[PDB]
Structure formats: structure tokens, C-alpha cells
């Protein structure tokens, strides 16, 4: 906020002006007498209108539905030994960075909890220029070779005749695409379980997806998988519950990272790498270059580099996140690519698709895209140059401008260089790699990996998406398709969806494990920006006031508390009109609110002396609570407020059900374990 | 340039970067091998000629031939009486400007010297917004109403089918359209004058054409006409003149601009008005809201408000002359439109047309169209956003920015209004005014208000266009019209193209005569920035130590001497190969250089033994000469230099012929006489 | 039909090619070798993958969420003495049409249910040119001058800062409007009534919202209102 403060417009206390410094008034058109037509030489109008009609630009062409943040990387050592690249030059060294989010089908205005893979472009504004990573929230991706990207994205996107269905792979033609093309089985059972459907940005892990190769500045290689491990805990949504999410508020994600950051609770990840030989491309029984392909942490540990907070939300989302145009080709010394057809054809790509978006060469001019290092080249013109290049001569090599700018290479200025051992061998050819066949092996492992309950998510996930496939034929592939991974899951979808089940076909079936792989197992590490719904009644008042109490016990873990009552009053956060189960990590009935979780609540005729309230839909409490426990929340019940969960014959026996006499230190420590433990899995049923 | 300059890049003794600030080398494509193939992964390549691929923006759709300066006006005085205009409010007021001279008809990289109208458009940068006025070097326009417009300009510009010819109006469909289109008429008499092809945009005066509206800050109005009083003097070519310069020099005006400026001969130019008053908008005899009218001097005379002087060139031609986007909607406070139909639909193209050259809506943030004065709007987003606006609530009425920004208008935060006594009254209509139908008796005004030779001048053209009009019926036509104006004029134009000469129609006929409308017929008031072309001989050494000898003697008036010779050496600024009559506004034969200058040099056989040079072509000193005398320049000879004169049949005792014996004060004061004089009108025929 | 049919690609049973007829295939790119670098001259990958990289246009900048559809307009009449519109001008004539309906606040790809005011736009393709009606589904609009839509939009859409919340008017910004410009209670009352919440684009009605003249032969003009009842 050194640099981008330069581009800040102010508009506290002050006048009206038009684009170009004049004074105006913009609430009425000039017209010809008091009920007259509007004129032509109205400018003001004009000008006004003009940038409305024009404020909007192409939605990316993927990931259109994202959230931005600023942050900043510290190295945690000197890794010259590993890389020339300067943010990772020196122990404490820092780097500005901004970071989007996303998911990747949906339009800019769907829904955040749509199932999908998800965005982590991170950004660092190095001292030797712009360098991104632009990576996913799952380490392998659908296919091979970037060539079939436009194949892959127009079967998952909206039918072409009706632009049916919204960012949803729950069609014939997605399922079409993933039966024909096996290489996107891994990436498939990754989004079809917890991966698909995170609680939060903050509660996912990054990837770099890709082998890259870091380089030193003689030359030296290594190969390596990019991570980002995240140092709050994987959290993850089940489908019911994501689907109500995206009713309720499509914003959900975006508003957590946004409140995060506002109330101080900076997330940070861990980057790390994977670091391997070049003699390793192929040593592992797969094929480095195959970007459907882990590595498991077993065999090669991840190296942690260094870490990033994000600490800033954007001043105008539009300039900073809509514009920001991140691109696998801002690479700096220190980095280079590999072979991974993926990844190469990505490049070109990136550069390309921001003409499309800016409608103009000049994007690295946009504020977010700038360099916080000297730019000096012979590069000039194109619409919306925004800069007075002084040097006439715009050539190499010159005498007129005395041979500057000079060109940078290894050993002089700096300069990028391309690892210096790379070569080429063979016939040119438009071919599939022998070495990227094995389609099947990797998805067993992921499946073999998981507790039971993602297991079943995965099958519940599958059986859900191929019931709202017509097509015989696709549904049949399909089941052939996952019989390779395992006859178990094969067999288990097949029996929601009509189709005969298959007997094992068992060339790739092992049982191999990597340890928490999945989204579902482990305990969160941080509770910071839970959300805890305290379930009161204005007519009983120190049932309002037990949320201050379990606030203050809560506070120190960075959770808070909101206030759910009939209506707007002191203390009350939010109605009962305006709350669902989906806001909150956990669910507590206040004492004194029991009153209003009738068993009859939902259908009871709205009669006089019945006495139904009009400030809330027909059992809206008794929703919340019965919503929270089928979806796997923390729900809790103070005093009386325990009437409620009778109501809802919800006993307090079960996991994740806890009782207390007031809102003290005893009930927050199991309000605490609860929220740690995140959903309680034996709410679940499981295929016997 | 405090302003401009955080916006330069410097480029001495640097490294080559990217766009984003890392440090490249771009002379070698990456390659597959030492003969290999180009690799996709080239960043470097693609990321360079990406950039060269897009350099090029749409050319201006009229007015696409121009060259820009940045200059500075000064108020004479507090005019505060006349106009709320704050650039107008303090004697000794500056403010800075940017000018862009310009032709209309001609496309980037046509001719500076083709025969067209000219544009004048100056940019105040005020401290309440910039102000421009986009206006000719001509007070009239051709047409009536803005909606002819691309009638006019398709009629003009080359035909569709071939695009045949460039920057002339010298073909079918333009006479065509001027001889059913008689408004035309009066414009065209002055193109097809000497303002039709000056020496250069420092010696014409310019115009905004249409009347404006003064107003003060109580709402008090005058009706304006702009004018720019050039303070150098009117200058301009005959046409085979012109036509050799295109052919020698394309960027001749554009050149003479950016030499004057670098050698601190800095043109300027006074700001006046002729003042009138809301009630005499038809006591004239025409109608002030006609742009095809002007106000004779003699009935409303211009007063003074001020002076431009342009004195600093562009440090990059595209980012501040290609880019620069003038309006007449770019209007402060204190200034009005009037319901002149050409002005008012002018209005709505050139904030349109900005969108097809900058590609998107935010244009006004290059930084040559930005203001010098705070930018405070409720206007959002589009493509090329170059700002972060703070306030997150862009709308008014607010209460969530605390009401800001505030309205502006008549009585509060200085803002723009319309001359609150505008009244509408009438049918609304598609009509040509009852007011606007004399077509003929101000061409005549001007017509006699010419010296001969630029009548003369008036006819050649016409005799030359008019040849190239194929259509018999469209020759005819034009002789019908120029008849209504003066029988005169039609029967001398007649009698090259075969038309019957016309009998008499004295409708329009008067002798009525306005002063000094012309562009021949007074002296130049400054020589600044003229050449004197010295044609020396380097196997006579003393020839050319009279170029020095010439310059001490005219440098006091700003003019510089070119010393001409057969070969590069020492004092020798140009050779004869490279020289041509139309680089010199007078030509003088050195002392010793008159054997060059031999009646039989065009012809003799350049046998071994003949001694003729093979440093310029056969005849070439003896065309400088020829050329000099037959396009009417000032011709003199120095000693000996005389038997060229003698050689060329150039008697000395025509005027604008000067000998002497050496280049003293003498011969300086006749030279000096001569440039003022600057053509020399007895050397061309007139009609008996 | 038989006009936009001209304008059809066809693609069953049929070879690949490119944009300019070149049979191509489409699977892999060129590589220097099994496991090498793609090639730049690879024009296959690069036409393909630069048709994808451009495929999006900007959305409307309101009512950016909508459908389509095509149908045919019948006329009941001779309406010669109401107005000159060809397409008015026999009982039983027909013209082709298209027709959009949309929200008003959401981008591209917000939801359906989404409580706001309906566009309701029909296009007549008439002998005499293009007619459309741009209507909605209520009949009174927020604000009485065009020059105040900024104002209402920006109101209305997501926050400057984080744009939240996506098509709805449940925030401070577009209240704070509402209050300080009362002309907008009407369709404001409108839209929080079922209007705002209707059941499917073939349950509402539609309105031109403005006055309009029709206009006869001989000048002679009506004020109307445009209503499409449902
Ligand atoms: C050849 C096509 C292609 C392929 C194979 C990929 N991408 Fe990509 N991606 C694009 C073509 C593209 C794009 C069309 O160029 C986008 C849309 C907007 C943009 O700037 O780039 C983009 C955007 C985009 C973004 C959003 C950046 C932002 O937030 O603005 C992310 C996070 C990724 N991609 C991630 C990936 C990953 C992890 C990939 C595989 C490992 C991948 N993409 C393969
Ligand atoms: C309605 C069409 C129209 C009409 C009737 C006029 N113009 Fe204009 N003119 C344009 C439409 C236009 C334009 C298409 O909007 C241009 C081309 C590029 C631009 O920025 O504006 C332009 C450019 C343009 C320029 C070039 C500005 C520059 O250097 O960039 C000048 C000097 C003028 N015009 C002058 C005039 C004069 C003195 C007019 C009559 C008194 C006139 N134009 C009538
Ligand atoms: C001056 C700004 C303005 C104002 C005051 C209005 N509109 Fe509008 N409207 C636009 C500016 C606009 C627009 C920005 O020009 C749009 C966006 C996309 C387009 O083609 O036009 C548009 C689109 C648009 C559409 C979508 C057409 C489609 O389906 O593509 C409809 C149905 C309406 N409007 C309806 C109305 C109604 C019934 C209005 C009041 C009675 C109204 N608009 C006032
Ligand atoms: C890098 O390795 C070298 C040689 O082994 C040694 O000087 C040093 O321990 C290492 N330096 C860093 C940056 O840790
Ligand atoms: C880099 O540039 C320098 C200076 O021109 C040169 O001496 C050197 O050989 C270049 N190449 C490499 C690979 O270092
Ligand atoms: C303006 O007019 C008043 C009254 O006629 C006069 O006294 C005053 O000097 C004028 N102001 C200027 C700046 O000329
Ligand atoms: C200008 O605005 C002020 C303050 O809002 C208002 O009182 C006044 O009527 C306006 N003045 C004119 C001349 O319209
Ligand atoms: C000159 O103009 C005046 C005023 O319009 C007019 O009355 C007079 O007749 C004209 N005289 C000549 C010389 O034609
Ligand atoms: C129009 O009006 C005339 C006279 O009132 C009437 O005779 C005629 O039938 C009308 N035309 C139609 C088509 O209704
Ligand atoms: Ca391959
Ligand atoms: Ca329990
Ligand atoms: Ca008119
Ligand atoms: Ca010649
Ligand atoms: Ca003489």
C-alpha cells in the first residue's frame, strides 16, 4: 500500500467533477423546458452514461468466479544452493504478493459452494520481477496435453443449445468427456470428494500441479512440485449442505476470506517443494511430466521454503481483483520449465487470452500487474500506453541510444536463462507419450487413501451427478471407466443409477495408501473465523445475554459468536428470518429459547391463538438446529435451551451433541473440541 | 513537465527487461538444437512480438495527417467581466497547452503539402478542466448541419472501390458533392486559395468557426467568434509548389514544427474574440449560428484575450500526438455551445470516436488527455481502469459517503451551466433553417476581396481539379454554381474544361470587399525558421566560406543558411543529390559555383571524357535554380554567381532577383527584403 | 427458420478442419520428440486454443442473466387508424420474433430466483425494419430521468470493495438509495411483492413501462401504454 497508493482516488468531501477535472451536477438531463426532450449537447449526460455502458469486460474464460487478497512471502532461508531466484535469496527476505481464489465452470456471479477444482494463483512482485504461480486447490489435473483443454472445458460448461447447467458437471456431456478420456479419473475422485466442496480458501492446501525446474546460477537443476500447505486445516462441506450454502449466500467464500482478514486472522500458507533429480523423471514407475500423476510424500518429502500471510483486502475490487492477470510465462531466473505438454501449451495461452480481457498489448500496465522492479525495453505503442518511452531509437543493436538497454543473460545483468542441459531428441510428432498410459493406478491410491465416510462421499457424490445423466451409453462407460479403479466403487454407483454391476477387471488394483490425502480425517489446526449461532429469544432476555458470556470464552480462539433472534434488538446480530444453519460452524440453543422448537412448529395452522410469529417462516429455528445436526455440525443446548434438541429428538448421547448448565469455560472447552473435530462423520450412513 | 515526467521511462545505460520487470536477452529465438525448431515455451519471443503485433491503433477517421507541441498560454488580463473562465481570470495567468495541427482528408503517412483543409485544435490544461478548441486554419466549414458529415467526407476521401486518390479532391465525387451541396462553396474558395496549401503551421491563424457563448458568473452571455492570430505572418505555396514538396519531403510542415521549436523559435499565436451580443444573431444580414458565414472584421473587430506560444516537442510521438483525444465537450465553466446544427452534432462524435481509437471507455486517463486539476466521480470500472477509486459507494444521492461527492453547479463548488436565458421554441424538426439559404454572396465577398494573383491562384486550381472530373454533368454543374458567386470566376474556370461559358445571374453579385482575407499580399511579420539554400562548389572552397559569411549576417533574424555542394565536407550541410528547390525559401548562387550551372547540363551525353559528375543527377543546381525563380522564391547570386543567372535566362532586374559582390550587410538587407516579400507574384499569368 | 438457417455449420458425420477448411486432427500437439517441447509452429494448437482463449464477450452491463427464444406475432386487426406500423396493418398478419427475459442485478451465471425486477424484450422483425419493445415485468421503474441509472445500479450491484452480495438488494448501499430517492417506492413495493419472485418467464406479464405516441399516415397521434398480457 506503498506502491498501489499511488493510484487512489479520494472522494471524501468533495465536488463533483467530469473525467477531466470539470465541476458538474449529474442528477438531471438538460431538456428543452420543463417537460421537454432531453438534448444532444447534454455532455454531462453523455459522459456519464458512456463509462456505465462500458464498465464491464470479458469474464475470464475460466475460472470467472473468484476472490482476491493481498499478502506477503518470507523466505525462511538462503536457497541459492537450490535456486537463483531472488525472493529466496536470504532468511527473512520478504516479497509482496496478491493472491486470487477460485473455482473454474461457473459464470462470475455463480454460486461459491458449486462443486469443482479451485483456483490458487499467488502472485510474489519480486525484485527481479513479477513471478506467479498459477495453481490449483488438487495436485493433478483432467488431461495430458493443453491442446484438449478446450475439449475438456466445453463438456463441463453449459450445454451449447440452452447454456444448461450452471457451473455443474451434473450432465451427459462431462461425464461423456471423463468416460472417453480416463487421465481425468484422478483428478475426478479428487472433486468428487471433500476437494470438491472446501468450507473456505482458508481451509484448502495450494498446488503447483506441475514438475518445474529450479535453477541455480551455474546452471544446476532440480526438479520440483510446488506446494502450498495451509496452517489452518483441511475443512470441508457435504453436498446437502453446499447446495443450501449456495441458496443462502452465493458469496459465502468470498465473505469469509474478506471478514477474515478484516478482523486480523491472516491465513497463511507454507510454500514448499518437492524436490527431485533429473535422473527421477521416470525412476518412480510414472512419468514426471504426466500432470496427472502425485508424487506421494512417502517417497519424496516437502521442503518448506518459506511462508505467505495474506493481510490486505482490495480498496476496489474491480481494479485490483477483476483486472489482476496472472500468467505461467512471469517466470525470473532461478525457475524453468519442463516438458510437461500441459504446462507447455499453457504458456501460450496466458499471454494470449489478456488481449481478450484488457482489448488491448498494454495489460502489464494495469496497476495490479506492474513490476516493483525497473521495466526497460524496446517494446512500444499499442492502444492505452500509459507510459512516455524517452528513447527514440527503440532497436538493438544500436549506437544511437549508445547499445542500452543492454541485453541481460547467465552470466551478465541477470538475465532469464533456460536450463542450460535441456535438449531435444526425436521426430516431430503429434503423439501420446507411451510413458502417460497408466490412467488407473494413482485414482486406486487416492481411493485406497481415504477414512470411509470421504469413501462414501465420493460414492454419494457420483451417484448423485450420473442419476442426472440420460444418456445409457455414457452411464455404462462411466461404470466401466471406475471398475478399473476398483470394483467396489464401481459396483456401488452402479446400483443408484440402473446399470448392471461389473465384475472386477483387477490389472490395476492395488493397495497402496499416502497418508491424509483426503479433505475429511484430521482436526483443524486453527479455529480462527468459525462461526458460532446462538439460538435466543427476545422475550427471555438473559438468553440474549449468554452470548456476550460464551463470546468472552470463545474470543481467545478466534471464534465468534453471533446472536440469532426473533428481531432486531441489543445485542441480537441477526433475525431468524435471516439465518440458516449453513452461516454457522456450530449450533447452540440459548437457555430460555426452547419456547420456540416446537415438534409441531413446521405445519401447526397459523391461527390466532396459536399465536405464530410473522417474524420468521414456520419452524425456521427448529430448521436451523435439525439442519446443523444432519449436516454433521458441533450443536449445543444451555439450561432449558435442551428442551429444543428433545424436540428434535436429537439426543445428547451422540458425538458432537453437548450439554451445559451456562455459558462457561466447561461448555466453550467442548464447543472447542467440537469445532476442532469440524463434522462428526457418524451421522453418515456407509454401504455395508 | 513536472506533470508528464512521472510518466517517462528512461532508457540510458540500462538492462533489457520484460514488460514485468525481468531481465531478458532478445536477439535469438529459442531453438530445439542449433537448426532447430522454435519453441512454444519462448516467453521472450512471443512476449515481443505480441507487443510489436498490436503497436498500431485505428488512424483519426478525419484529421489522421498532424504533428503536435506542447506550449503555454498567458491571459492578458482579468476578463472576468466576459467570462467565468478561469484560465481568463488574472493578467499574467498561464496555463499549460498541448496544439495538434493537422490536414483532414488524407490518411497516416499522406502528404503535408496536399491542398486541404487544416486543423488547429488547442488544449487548455486549466485548474477547472480541460478546455479545448478544435478548430481549422480556415473561419468557415463546408457544411451546414454535423448529420452531412460522412456525406461530405465519404464524397472527399478516395473512391470505395479503389481507394484512388490520397489526400485530394481533385475526382468526381467530391465536385459532385460540392455542386449539389452550395454551402460548400464559400470553404471552398478559401481551400482552393493559399490557405489551401500554406509554407507551414506557423505562418496560418486559426479558428474555432462556429459562434460560442461567453458567460459569467452571474449568467450574463456574449456571443463569440475564436480566432488565433498567427504572429508570424501568413505564408503559402502555388500548387506545383506544394506538389514537388510531397514529393521531396512528405514531413515537410511536420519537420519545419519540430525544427523551429528545437532551435527555440517558438511560434505563438493571440487568443481574441469578436464580441457580440444575443441579439444580434441575424441583424447581420446572415445568421451566427451558420458556419459557413464569417463576421467581417470590419463590422465587429477581435479583441485580444491573450497569447499561445508553442515551445517544447513530444518526447514520444504515439503516447502524447497519436494519442492525443481532443472534444469540443471538453468545456469549463464560463463557456456555452450555441444551437449552430454543426457544433451541436459534433458534440456526440468525438466523445464516440474515442472509443474506436483507444479501444474501451478510459481514455480520458492517458496521460496526455488526463487533467491538471482532481478527479472526483461516481464513474466505475471499463477496460484499462488505471485508477483504485477508495469509495465503495459510487452513487448520489448518498449517505454512506457522507453525501459526497457533491453537486456543482451555477451557485456552489464552481460548477458548469448551461446560459440559464436558453430558450427552445418550435415544431421539432428535420429542416434546413430559412436563415441559411444564401449560399453565394459571402463566396463573392471573399472572391473580391483577393489580390489578382490569388484570384488567378482561385482559378488554377479549380482549372486542375475540375480537369480530373470525368462527369460532364458534374463539370457543368460546378460552372452553374461558381457563376451564382461571379461570372468571372465561372467562364475563366470554364474555358480549361470545356463548359460552355455561362451567361450572367446577378442575384448574388456585389463589390463589397473585406481586409487582408488572403493568404498572398502582405510581408511576413518574423523570418524566423525561413532557409536560404547558398549553391556552392567544394572545387571552389571560397564559394562555401560564403555560407558563414551569409549566416552571421541573417542570424539576428532567426534565418538559417543551408550550404549546398557536390559532396560532404567540411561547412557543407547537404548535397546536390539530396537537395531540391522546395527545402529553400530563397536559393542564392555562391561566388565560384557557376560552372555547375552550364544551359546545356540537362542534356549533354555523360561520356567518359565529358566531365560531368555522377555526384547528382544530369542538370540538378540548374533545376534548384529554375524551380526557385519559376515557384516565385527570392533568387539571388553573389560575384561571379551571377553567369549562372545569366545561364538560367534570370534577368536581374526582375523583381525578387538580387546580385552583389559579396555576402556583406547589403546583400543581407536585400535578401532580407525579399524573404519578407517571401513570393514574388509577378512571375505567374493572369486571366486578361 | 429459413432465414437463419443460411447462417448454420452442420457438423454430423463429418471431417475435422480448421477455420479455413484444412482437415486437421486435434488430440496432441507437436512435440520434438515422445517427450519433448511443443513447437511453435504448431498452427493447429495455436488456431484452437486462440479461439478459446477469446471466446467470451462482456456480459450486459444489466440484465446480463437471461434466456431466449423465438416465436411469431399474429395482428387481431387492421389498426391502420391507430398507427402506420406495418406489422399492425392486417387482421392475420404474422411477423417473426425473438424474445429475451432476464433479472436485472446478477452477472452471468447468478441464479434464476433471484428476487428483482424481470426484463421482458421482444423483437418483431417487421417488412419495415426492426421493432423492439424493451420492456419488463412491472410497469413503473425506479427512477424518473435516465441519468440517474448509474446511481441505481451501482446502488443495487455488489459492493465496490469485495462485491458482495451477488443479485440482491439485501445491503446497505441499494436502502440507502432507496430512502433518499422515494421516487423508486413503487417499483420497489412491486418487487418485494410476488413479482419479484415469479415462478417462470411464462407466468408474468410485460409492460413498455413509458408512454409512447402511435403515429397514423397522416400524423394524427395516441398516447399508449404497451402491455403483454400473459
Ligand atoms: C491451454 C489452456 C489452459 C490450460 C491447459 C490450463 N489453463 Fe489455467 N487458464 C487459461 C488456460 C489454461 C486461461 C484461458 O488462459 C486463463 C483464463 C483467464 C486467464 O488469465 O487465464 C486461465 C486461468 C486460470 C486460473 C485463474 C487465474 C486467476 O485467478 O485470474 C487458474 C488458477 C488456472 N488457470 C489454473 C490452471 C491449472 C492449475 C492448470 C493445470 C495444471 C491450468 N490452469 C491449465
Ligand atoms: C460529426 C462529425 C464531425 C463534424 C461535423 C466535425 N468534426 Fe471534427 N472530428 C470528428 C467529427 C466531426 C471526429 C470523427 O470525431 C474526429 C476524428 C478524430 C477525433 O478525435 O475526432 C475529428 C477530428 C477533428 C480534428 C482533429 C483533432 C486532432 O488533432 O486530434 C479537428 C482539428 C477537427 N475535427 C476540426 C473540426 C472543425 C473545425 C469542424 C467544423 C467547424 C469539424 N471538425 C466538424
Ligand atoms: C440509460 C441507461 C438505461 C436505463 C435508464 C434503462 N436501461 Fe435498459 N439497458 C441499458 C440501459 C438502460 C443498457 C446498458 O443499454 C442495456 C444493457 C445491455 C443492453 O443491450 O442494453 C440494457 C438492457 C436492458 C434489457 C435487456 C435486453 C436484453 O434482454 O438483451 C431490458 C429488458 C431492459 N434494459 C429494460 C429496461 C426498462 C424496462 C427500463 C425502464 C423503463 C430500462 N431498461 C431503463
Ligand atoms: C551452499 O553450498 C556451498 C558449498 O557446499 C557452501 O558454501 C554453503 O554451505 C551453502 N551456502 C548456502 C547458501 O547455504
Ligand atoms: C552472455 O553475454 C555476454 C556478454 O555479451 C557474453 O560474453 C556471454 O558469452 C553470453 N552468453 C552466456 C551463455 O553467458
Ligand atoms: C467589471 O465591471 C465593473 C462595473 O462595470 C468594473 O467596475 C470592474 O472594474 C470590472 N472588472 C474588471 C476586472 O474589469
Ligand atoms: C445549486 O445547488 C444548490 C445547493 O444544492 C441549490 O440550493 C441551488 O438551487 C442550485 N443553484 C441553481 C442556480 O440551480
Ligand atoms: C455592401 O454591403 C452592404 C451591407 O450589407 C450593402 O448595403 C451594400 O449594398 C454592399 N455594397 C456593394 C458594393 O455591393
Ligand atoms: C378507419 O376509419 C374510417 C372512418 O372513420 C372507417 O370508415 C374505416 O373503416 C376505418 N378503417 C379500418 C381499417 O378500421
Ligand atoms: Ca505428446
Ligand atoms: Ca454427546
Ligand atoms: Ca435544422
Ligand atoms: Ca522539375
Ligand atoms: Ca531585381
Given at each position: 500500500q506503498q506502491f498501489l497508493s499511488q493510484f487512489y482516488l479520494n472522494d471524501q468531501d468533495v465536488y463533483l467533477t467530469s473525467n477531466v477535472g470539470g465541476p458538474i451536477q449529474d442528477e438531471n438531463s438538460l431538456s428543452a423546458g420543463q417537460r421537454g426532450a432531453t438534448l444532444l449537447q447534454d455532455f454531462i449526460f453523455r459522459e456519464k452514461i458512456q463509462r456505465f455502458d462500458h464498465e464491464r469486460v470479458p469474464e475470464r474464460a475460466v475460472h470467472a468466479r473468484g476472490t482476491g487478497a493481498h499478502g506477503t512471502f518470507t523466505s525462511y532461508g538462503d536457497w541459492s544452493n537450490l535456486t537463483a531466484a531472488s525472493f529466496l535469496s536470504a532468511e527473512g527476505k520478504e516479497t509482496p504478493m496478491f493472491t486470487r481464489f477460485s473455482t473454474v465452470a461457473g459464470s462470475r456471479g455463480s454460486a461459491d459452494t458449486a462443486r469443482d477444482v479451485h483456483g490458487f494463483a499467488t502472485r510474489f512482485y519480486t525484485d527481479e520481477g513479477n513471478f506467479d504461480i498459477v495453481g490449483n486447490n488438487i495436485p493433478v489435473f483432467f488431461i495430458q496435453d493443453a491442446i484438449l483443454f478446450p475439449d475438456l472445458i466445453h463438456a463441463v460448461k453449459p450445454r451449447g443449445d440452452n447454456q444448461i447447467p450452471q457451473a455443474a458437471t451434473a450432465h451427459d456431456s462431462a461425464w461423456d468427456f471423463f468416460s472417453q478420456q480416463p487421465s481425468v479419473l484422478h483428478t475426478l475422485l479428487w472433486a468428487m470428494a471433500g476437494h470438491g466442496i472446501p468450507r473456505s480458501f482458508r481451509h484448502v492446501n495450494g498446488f503447483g500441479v506441475h514438475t518445474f525446474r529450479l535453477v541455480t546460477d551455474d546452471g544446476k537443476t532440480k526438479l520440483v512440485k510446488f506446494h502450498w500447505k495451509g496452517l489452518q486445516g483441511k475443512a470441508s462441506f457435504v453436498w446437502e449442505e453446499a447446495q443450501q450454502t449456495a441458496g443462502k449466500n452465493a458469496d459465502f467464500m468470498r465473505q469469509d476470506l474478506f471478514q477474515s482478514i478484516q478482523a486480523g486472522r491472516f491465513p497463511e500458507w507454507e510454500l514448499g517443494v518437492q524436490i527431485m533429480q533429473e535422473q527421477d523423471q521416470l525412476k518412480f514407475g510414472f512419468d514426471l511430466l504426466d500432470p496427472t500423476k502425485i508424487v506421494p510424500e512417502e517417497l519424496v518429502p516437502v521442503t518448506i521454503l518459506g511462508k505467505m500471510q495474506l493481510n490486505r483486502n482490495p480498496m476496489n475490487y474491480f481494479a485490483e481483483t477483476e483486472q489482476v492477470m496472472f500468467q505461467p510465462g512471469h517466470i525470473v531466473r532461478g525457475v524453468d520449465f519442463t516438458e510437461d505438454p500441459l504446462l507447455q501449451g499453457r504458456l501460450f495461452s496466458y499471454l494470449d487470452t489478456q488481449l481478450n480481457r484488457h482489448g488491448g498489448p498494454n495489460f502489464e500496465q494495469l496497476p495490479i500487474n506492474r513490476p516493483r522492479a525497473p521495466i526497460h525495453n524496446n517494446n512500444r505503442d499499442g492502444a492505452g500506453q500509459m507510459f512516455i518511452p524517452l528513447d527514440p531509437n527503440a532497436y538493438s543493436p544500436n549506437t544511437e541510444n549508445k547499445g542500452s538497454p543492454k541485453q541481460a543473460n547467465e552470466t551478465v545483468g541477470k538475465g532469464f536463462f533456460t536450463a542450460p542441459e535441456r535438449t531435444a531428441s526425436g521426430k516431430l510428432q503429434r503423439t501420446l507419450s507411451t510413458t502417460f498410459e497408466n490412467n488407473w493406478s494413482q485414482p486406486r491410491l487416492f481411493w485406497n487413501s481415504l477414512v470411509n465416510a470421504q469413501k462414501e462421499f465420493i460414492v454419494d457424490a457420483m451417484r448423485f451427478e450420473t442419476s442426472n445423466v440420460s444418456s445409457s451409453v455414457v452411464r455404462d462407460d462411466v461404470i466401466i471407466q471406475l471398475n478399473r479403479i476398483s470394483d467396489?466403487?464401481?459396483?456401488?454407483?452402479?446400483?443408484?443409477?440402473?446399470?448392471?454391476?461389473?465384475?472386477?477387471?483387477?490389472?490395476?488394483?492395488?493397495?497402496?495408501?499416502?497418508?491424509?490425502?483426503?479433505?475429511?480425517?484430521?482436526?483443524?489446526?486453527?479455529?480462527?473465523?468459525?462461526?458460532?449461532?446462538?439460538?435466543?429469544?427476545?422475550?427471555?432476555?438473559?438468553?440474549?445475554?449468554?452470548?456476550?458470556?460464551?463470546?468472552?470464552?470463545?474470543?481467545?480462539?478466534?471464534?465468534?459468536?453471533?446472536?440469532?433472534?426473533?428481531?432486531?434488538?441489543?445485542?441480537?446480530?441477526?433475525?431468524?428470518?435471516?439465518?440458516?444453519?449453513?452461516?454457522?460452524?456450530?449450533?447452540?440453543?440459548?437457555?430460555?429459547?426452547?419456547?420456540?422448537?416446537?415438534?409441531?412448529?413446521?405445519?401447526?395452522?397459523?391461527?390466532?391463538?396459536?399465536?405464530?410469529?410473522?417474524?420468521?417462516?414456520?419452524?425456521?429455528?427448529?430448521?436451523?438446529?435439525?439442519?446443523?445436526?444432519?449436516?454433521?455440525?458441533?450443536?449445543?443446548?444451555?439450561?432449558?435451551?435442551?428442551?429444543?434438541?428433545?424436540?428434535?429428538?436429537?439426543?445428547?448421547?451422540?458425538?458432537?451433541?453437548?450439554?451445559?448448565?451456562?455459558?462457561?469455560?466447561?461448555?466453550?472447552?467442548?464447543?472447542?473440541?467440537?469445532?476442532?473435530?469440524?463434522?462428526?462423520?457418524?451421522?453418515?450412513?456407509?454401504?455395508?
Open positions: 467396489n466403487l464401481a459396483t456401488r454407483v452402479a446400483s443408484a443409477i440402473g446399470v448392471e454391476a461389473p465384475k472386477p477387471n483387477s490389472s490395476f488394483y492395488h493397495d497402496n495408501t499416502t497418508a491424509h490425502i483426503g479433505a475429511f480425517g484430521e482436526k483443524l489446526a486453527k479455529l480462527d473465523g468459525l462461526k458460532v449461532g446462538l439460538l435466543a429469544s427476545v422475550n427471555k432476555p438473559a438468553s440474549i445475554a449468554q452470548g456476550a458470556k460464551l463470546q468472552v470464552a470463545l474470543s481467545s480462539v478466534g471464534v465468534d459468536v453471533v446472536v440469532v433472534a426473533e428481531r432486531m434488538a441489543n445485542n441480537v446480530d441477526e433475525t431468524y428470518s435471516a439465518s440458516d444453519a449453513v452461516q454457522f460452524d456450530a449450533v447452540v440453543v440459548a437457555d430460555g429459547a426452547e419456547g420456540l422448537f416446537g415438534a409441531d412448529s413446521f405445519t401447526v395452522e397459523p391461527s390466532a391463538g396459536s399465536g405464530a410469529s410473522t417474524l420468521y417462516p414456520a419452524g425456521r429455528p427448529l430448521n436451523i438446529l435439525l439442519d446443523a445436526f444432519r449436516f454433521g455440525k458441533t450443536v449445543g443446548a444451555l439450561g432449558s435451551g435442551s428442551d429444543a434438541l428433545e424436540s428434535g429428538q436429537i439426543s445428547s448421547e451422540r458425538q458432537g451433541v453437548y450439554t451445559g448448565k451456562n455459558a462457561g469455560d466447561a461448555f466453550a472447552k467442548d464447543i472447542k473440541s467440537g469445532l476442532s473435530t469440524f463434522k462428526f462423520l457418524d451421522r453418515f450412513a456407509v454401504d455395508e
